Design an enzyme around this catalytic site. Structure first.
Site, PDB file in Angstrom:
ATOM      1  N   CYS A  96      -0.251  -1.602   6.845  1.00  0.00           N
ATOM      2  CA  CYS A  96      -1.420  -1.981   7.684  1.00  0.00           C
ATOM      3  C   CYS A  96      -1.574  -3.496   7.851  1.00  0.00           C
ATOM      4  O   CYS A  96      -2.053  -4.000   8.917  1.00  0.00           O
ATOM      5  CB  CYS A  96      -2.733  -1.419   7.090  1.00  0.00           C
ATOM      6  SG  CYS A  96      -2.618  -0.383   5.599  1.00  0.00           S
ATOM      7  N   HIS A 129      -5.034  -0.922   1.021  1.00  0.00           N
ATOM      8  CA  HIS A 129      -5.274  -0.734   2.439  1.00  0.00           C
ATOM      9  C   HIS A 129      -5.719  -2.131   2.959  1.00  0.00           C
ATOM     10  O   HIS A 129      -6.276  -2.923   2.206  1.00  0.00           O
ATOM     11  CB  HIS A 129      -6.308   0.387   2.659  1.00  0.00           C
ATOM     12  CG  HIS A 129      -6.519   0.749   4.101  1.00  0.00           C
ATOM     13  ND1 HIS A 129      -5.533   0.626   5.060  1.00  0.00           N
ATOM     14  CD2 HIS A 129      -7.603   1.251   4.742  1.00  0.00           C
ATOM     15  CE1 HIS A 129      -6.006   1.011   6.231  1.00  0.00           C
ATOM     16  NE2 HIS A 129      -7.259   1.399   6.065  1.00  0.00           N
ATOM     17  N   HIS A 175      -8.984  -6.696   2.417  1.00  0.00           N
ATOM     18  CA  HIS A 175      -8.126  -5.777   1.689  1.00  0.00           C
ATOM     19  C   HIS A 175      -8.864  -5.084   0.517  1.00  0.00           C
ATOM     20  O   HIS A 175      -9.429  -5.747  -0.358  1.00  0.00           O
ATOM     21  CB  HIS A 175      -6.884  -6.536   1.229  1.00  0.00           C
ATOM     22  CG  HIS A 175      -6.216  -5.942   0.041  1.00  0.00           C
ATOM     23  ND1 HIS A 175      -6.495  -6.355  -1.246  1.00  0.00           N
ATOM     24  CD2 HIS A 175      -5.291  -4.961  -0.060  1.00  0.00           C
ATOM     25  CE1 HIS A 175      -5.775  -5.644  -2.092  1.00  0.00           C
ATOM     26  NE2 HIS A 175      -5.037  -4.793  -1.398  1.00  0.00           N
TER      27      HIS A 175
END
Lengths: 474, 474, 474, 474
Positions: free
Chosen positions: C20, C380, C372
């Protein structure tokens, strides 16, 4: 209103201007028999408030032995060292009271300098001599010195030994110092300073950590005799402490697990995961006399799915999870156990490091504990003192001398528990059993003729007040 | 030592025997202008301590208006209702002080019974009449009654409305009762009783829940006019409260999840599971100047496996877990959101239930708040009072009358925050704007000739003390 | 199952292998318009994975502008820098992705070295130059250096300014160093490293202090221009901080008063003393519809003495206590107030130290925040980005680009609140308004003919799938 | 990979589908020797899954005695009662397993109805009969009934006795009921239901109060024999409990004293008052190697006044305070002591109420404890069982049968400590010593010829696998 002794008990002291520190410190010296003999076998040998004090002390000791009445007014003697700071601490008042005796027993030990040079029976009891292995600047240095009460500082430490080792080692081409005892007094005292700066607050205050101390204290580790072995133990201790720290860190992570700010036991997260996976699935949770057989459970709720459960799950998603978690859970449940078990052992090992013959050879009975509640300048003080003969801890609080216990003592003295806490520990050498705790035998009526008189007059004077108590019924 | 008013401010009261309850209650009545007129336009019309009290009250009001000096000694008037209980509560002392006025304004309203029958201007301000729909035993019953301050009880409730609805409904072939207002006073007062039994303790004490009340209070829901609609709202309220309870329960389970005694957020257990599964595996955890590119992270630790990680894991055990958890996490992250969002809405709905035209029609300005810190019998008291004209909350604490705020008031009055808390709220009818907050216009010099004299004498007398202050520089 | 854009919104990215960090960092660069122009006006000029990457980036940007469908699969481009570490960090993957561009825009800026020497438009945006007043060893030293993202460390600090001042000063015949900016980039980025060693645990973890940062950041204090004044402010700051520390200590003692281990507010001890003195005395506590007048209290308990009250008390013991305490209470109630008031002021003063013209001259809009959640290696990631034109904060989480807020952003980014926390802040120069946030005007259809084609083909291809969706109703 | 018994230990069970409840309940019945004899001396006498089950049970018991290998697979027998709910609780599975035996031992006790009418040896062990003094509606009622496990509910209670008395009395022209035992089984079981509704949550959950139970349980209070005396004790208990409640309330007030929301120990407020009065006065606190004598204190801070102290104080304000407080402090320090001492005694009294001959006459050994961790439907289960002969608590967890302790047992069983908690207690009658814990003497080889064969075959079969283990070294 006429209250005397009870079955010839111990007698307390009505302290006069919240100067309880006196009663505390006196009752400690009084119950140390050898010193009590010394004070009663003293006459003025032929700062000179020194001598009339010790006369009134002599008179108060006399009273403490052979009074029939419950307490004594020591203010006669107090008044003397009180005005002696006119022309202002609480721990200077005493510092003088010890100088007075130290000096005054020097005076009356100087009656046999007719064929001689000095030797002081007070200084013989309290003072000892320690050596200082000081590698202070590149070159080594080695100073032996006299010492009275060894002062110890308390922040951080759990027990007295910990509190003492660390108090005798300072620092360490790197400067450094370490003490060892050469000659112990028979009557070994320690100071426990709890004062420390409180950055949150303005100024220095009493610390309140629990600090525990033993009824029997074995000093052998702290001496030149065992200098070699001690130093070797101390390494192994450190290298073990080092080790358990790793075990403790590695344990903490099992117990307090998580990437986030709140973290939980890994056991519990795995357990609660499998509970949720194993929870009976659901799709819409935002809008809506009987005989019992032996091992059954009544009242077990119906299994209707609800609340949080997952929306869907394969049979072969489930049994992967169940394999994976139910395995891991056990991998943790044991790792935890092994880490706790590893630590317990290492603790045990450290406890026993100094624990057998050769290091169980210099034992000391805790004789008296002086405790203080309250603020730095203004407190209350009192004392705990071992009976020895009756073999019971006695709590001397001003007027009132109660039969007490080690368990009780502990609550006042160790700190943390109450506001109070101990500040002087007074140990005596077990081996020097009777040099201190004898009673010079021959076979109230145990006192010089001087005092035997006064004490009996003053008995009778107090007796008349009781004739006058039942004569004042009519 | 000569301190007078400041720019013609408000004047406080030196209360005399910690009887502050007086200054509190008086300053509240004094600042209610109509009542102040009434007391100044009263002369003894021709329990008879009644009348010399009200004379000294008249004199103290006079003083409170036109003194030049900072405070007044009301003890002249206090002394009167003080000895009036000889031949003993704090809330009887006042109960009499209100009887006295109630009765004494009846006396001087009886000077025009020459062609008439009674009508009392004090009783016109404070008292009102409420109806009682009491279905008390099988058959219905319907009693309208007079009322002074409505007494409210505080345990449990958040706001005043909650605290009032529930105080006006009692019970409910099942007995029951409900009140509605018929006629409001213009000067509507409420009691907030915080006393309740404390089972843990012995006896009844002050509760300390925060209880909040508005600056503007709309009473229309509480009357026969809207009896029909209110009753219909009250159902919907209840049926909604019922609903959110289910949402709140169903939420709690997401937030406080677990079979064990300690329970954690389901989000966090799933998150921390996947962290552990995704942790880099391990077998033996019981024995052992640079230019930075834009979006990089310095200082990110090395990925060396350790501490707790699992002992082994398939690639196809992992990606099942990752599918399952990373899905479920999101299933929760939303369900939570939806449950909070559902609740917020239901709360909003309940807030607005009584909120538009037809139910925004009977408004009341909070005029004064009486607050009390301390124990049941012995307290301190003081008051907050709205200026109206200057339009600012004024804090009247005995001698000292300070400019204050709603925010400050709130800290004292609502409870929870300080030890203090409010016990009387005093609201006035907005519509009856000037029947109470007028100043009868014509165009210190606003007082009868009686009082205008005394107040000016007593001014001058106090003036001389100031001539004597700069004349006492030499 | 056919979901396209909604009213020509922004388009997200389906990230492929929990990578991501890509979508995060790309969407940040994409929304920075000037850089987006640069990437679209790049053709391969004539480590050489460098160029086919930037081709696929060019293709993905094209798509992000003129796709009709909700998201794009950037894996084409990801795959390229993915296998580029074969023959392994997450913050090396990016470090390369920036090298690639930095190097690749150098290549295509070298097409006009026909009459010239270099100049790089990427490096023009991100990089700047700071000076280093380093008094490093006795003698002074002064190094100016290039810098990319300034890395900041977060432990202890409250706000970004605090977090930056302290990050630019290191140390201080005593060595020392201090930075100042010489030339800022227009696109100024900061790193917020929360990693720190956790002694309780084994290893270094994310810290979780809240650390707050502004929407507008004024950099003028941090530069050679204001080197003189800043240094003068910084003294006064320190000398004030020093001061309030004394006030804070001296306050703490009022609030947290006591000699014991548990300590309480001095106010409360004095209040509760007087309550007990004023308590109604006692000798044996070890063996045993009404109309309410306005300002009364119903329910006030009876005054029957009980529980703890003292055994006896003079009238002239009481009123000494009452004089003494009720005085002191007020002496404290004010001292507290004055100490809080003193502090508030000093805080205010420090807040405003750098706050007016001359020091409000170098403003920066927070453009993007990268946040984060999760562990050090495996997280993530997602991003918040200011719209500028629509003037609204947009939350870019992989596939899903939602309209968001500053208030929401704050909950994720600042730390403490959620598990998540920000790690890159990306500010842009307000003055350089359109060098970055322009739209080169002339008057999907905003793209080179290359990409305009592909994007329209790929539109139509996706269109057919929708013809096939309503044609698949039958 | 070949693991057999260890020195002829006890053998566990590999449970098959997380149906551990089986191993738990079986191992409990197996270790109860009389019942084990019964199952081995059963042959099918000549719902009929009943009989092939008990055959496979017979075979599994046989195995549990004379296997040489570490555990057995009981799934043969489990499978039988598993599919018996097809054509679904965990506490129905067992309820059937008990019916099966109850019914099946009825069948084989019906082989001697040739000259007779029934009598069942299983039902003889588990079941007993209790009487019900039910004054249920105006008139009295008196029902004696059979009972299996007595079910007890756990909320609120501390110990089992408390938990049982209250479970046998229901209610109390007022309806009511009370049980007494008439005939105890020798093998007396209790259920501990921890399920209760959790209003905060949605649904009913396990309670987690610690509930403690004895190794020896004396039942005599719970029977018709002592119906008279018990009822008399129960009054005195209640009237004492009533009393200490007053002492506890009256104590709480000393400990948790204050009119405000935060309240502190009265001791401490008086102590801290006098500290502040005794504090050295001040006017402006808003703007600014040594030899130690025995009983001295080093490090005692200087007495410089500061922080909070009062602004002024008479000598005769001080010594009034000091008289008043230092007196009261002691008045409290004792009242507290007396209240604690009063309570301790009353507790003691209640502990001993049922404690001597006549009420120490019906003793029961706790034989087995069944404990369960996990959620309502899905748990883990295991058991603790007394060895009797070896005289040690053994923990039977599925496969793994470990030597354990009472201390360990306690941590799992009592609740509060772990997530786990006990749900069946199984006591056996001490007097019926060998009717249950005998070993029928005559003088693996202790089994019928049927089973002795199978068990030895199956031994040998398992032996070959070990010949094959050292033969598989080459």
């Amino acid at each position: 209103y006429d209250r005397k002794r009870q079955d010839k008990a111990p007698v307390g002291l009505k302290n006069v201007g919240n100067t309880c520190w006196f009663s505390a410190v006196i009752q400690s010296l009084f119950n140390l028999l050898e010193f009590r003999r010394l004070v009663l076998n003293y006459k003025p040998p032929s700062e000179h408030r020194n001598l009339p004090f010790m006369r009134e002390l002599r008179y108060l000791f006399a009273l403490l032995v052979g009074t029939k009445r419950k307490y004594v007014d020591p203010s006669r003697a107090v008044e003397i060292l009180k005005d002696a700071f006119k022309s202002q601490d609480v721990s200077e008042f005493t510092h003088k009271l010890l100088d007075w005796l130290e000096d005054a027993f020097q005076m009356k030990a100087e009656e046999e300098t007719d064929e001689e040079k000095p030797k002081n029976p007070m200084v013989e009891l309290f003072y000892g001599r320690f050596l200082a292995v000081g590698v202070l600047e590149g070159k080594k240095f080695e100073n032996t010195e006299m010492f009275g009460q060894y002062p110890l500082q308390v922040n951080g430490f759990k027990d007295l030994h910990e509190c003492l080792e660390a108090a005798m080692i300072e620092g360490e081409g790197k400067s450094g110092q370490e003490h060892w005892f050469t000659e112990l007094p028979p009557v070994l005292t320690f100071e426990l300073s709890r004062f420390e700066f409180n950055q949150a607050l303005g100024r220095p205050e009493k610390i309140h950590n629990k600090l525990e101390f033993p009824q029997v204290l074995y000093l052998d580790r702290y001496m030149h005799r065992n200098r070699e072995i001690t130093r070797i133990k101390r390494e192994e201790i450190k290298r073990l402490k080092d080790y358990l720290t790793v075990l403790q860190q590695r344990l903490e992570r099992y117990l307090s697990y998580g990437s986030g700010p709140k973290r939980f036991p890994l056991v519990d997260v795995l357990q609660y995961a499998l509970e949720f996976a194993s929870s009976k699935p659901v799709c819409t949770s935002p809008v809506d006399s009987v005989i019992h057989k032996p091992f059954t459970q009544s009242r077990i709720p119906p299994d209707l799915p609800m609340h949080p459960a997952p929306r869907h799950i394969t049979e072969e998603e489930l049994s992967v999870l169940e394999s994976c978690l139910h395995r891991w859970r056990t991998e943790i449940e044991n790792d935890t156990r092994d880490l706790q078990e590893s630590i317990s052992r290492i603790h045990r090992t450290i406890e026993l490091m100094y624990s057998d013959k050769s290091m169980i050879q210099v034992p000391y009975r805790l004789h008296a504990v002086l405790v203080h509640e309250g603020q730095a300048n203004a407190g209350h003080y009192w004392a705990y003192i071992f009976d020895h003969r009756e073999s019971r801890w006695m709590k001397y609080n001003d007027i009132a001398v109660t039969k007490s216990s080690w368990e009780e003592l502990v609550r006042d003295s160790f700190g943390g528990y109450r506001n109070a806490s101990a500040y002087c520990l007074m140990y005596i050498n077990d081996k020097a059993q009777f040099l201190i705790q004898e009673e010079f035998n021959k076979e109230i009526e145990t006192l010089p003729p001087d005092l035997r008189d006064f004490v009996e007059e003053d008995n009778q004077r107090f007796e008349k007040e009781l004739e006058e108590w039942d004569a004042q019924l009519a």
